[PDB]
Paper text:
Chromatin remodeling complex NoRC (nucleolar remodeling complex) interacts with the rDNA promoter regions of silent genes repressing rDNA transcription. Both proteins contain a MBD (methyl-CpG-binding domain), also known as TAM (TTF-IIP5, ARBP, MeCP1) domain, AT-hook DNA-binding domains, DDT (DNA binding homeobox and different transcription factors), and a PHD (plant homeodomain) zinc finger adjacent to a BRD at their C terminus.
The crystal structure of BAZ2B BRD with acetylated H3K14 revealed sequence-specific interactions of the BRD. As expected, the carbonyl group of H3K14ac formed the canonical hydrogen bond with the conserved N2140 as well as a water-mediated hydrogen bond with Y2097. The complex was further stabilized by additional hydrogen bonds mediated between the BRD backbone and H3 peptide amide bonds. The BAZ2B BC loop contains two acidic residues (E2141 and D2142) that formed electrostatic interactions with the side chain of H3R17. An additional hydrogen bond was formed between Nε-H of the arginine side chain and the carbonyl of the E2137 backbone. The shallower surface area for the PB1 BRD displays how the peptide extends through the ZA loop, forming weak protein-protein interactions with selectivity driven through H3A15 specific contacts, whereas the deeper hydrophobic binding cavity of BAZ2B accommodates more efficiently the ε-acetyl-lysine 14.
Numbering used by the authors:
A (entry chain A): 2060 to 2165
B (entry chain D): 12 to 19
Write the structure that this text describes.
């Protein structure tokens, strides 16, 4: 129940984020089997391809719900990883990019 | 895989 225009703009932000050089940790779900410990720290895993699926299948009724899942990607990364790492910096850079891109779009 | 866990 996002209209055509909102669906379109969220889809563009997701593609822009997918293209960004700091997007590499977030493209696909964390593999719970080879990151033992992940799931005991992280209550709800989330990544961009799951967001894409949920967007394409009508699971986001409005703009806020979509933004909520995007933030959860970067909150998960910050909870799990040291800030002083390539992955930690990647998360902080993508959050900054997203929030600016969100403000400028809406 | 690219991870830098705070714990462990
Ligand atoms: Zn931070
Ligand atoms: Zn630490």
């Amino acid at each position: 129940s996002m209209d055509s225009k909102d669906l379109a703009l969220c889809s563009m932000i997701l593609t822009e984020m997918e293209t960004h050089e700091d997007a590499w940790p977030f493209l696909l779900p964390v593999n719970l089997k080879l990151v033992p410990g992940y799931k005991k720290v992280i209550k709800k895993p989330m990544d961009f391809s799951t967001i894409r699926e949920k967007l394409s299948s009508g699971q986001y009724p409005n703009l806020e719900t979509f933004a909520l899942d995007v933030r959860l990607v970067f909150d998960n990364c910050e909870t799990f990883n040291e800030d002083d790492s390539d992955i930690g910096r990647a998360g902080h850079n993508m959050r900054k990019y997203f929030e600016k891109k969100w403000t400028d779009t809406f | 895989g690219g991870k830098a866990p705070r714990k462990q």
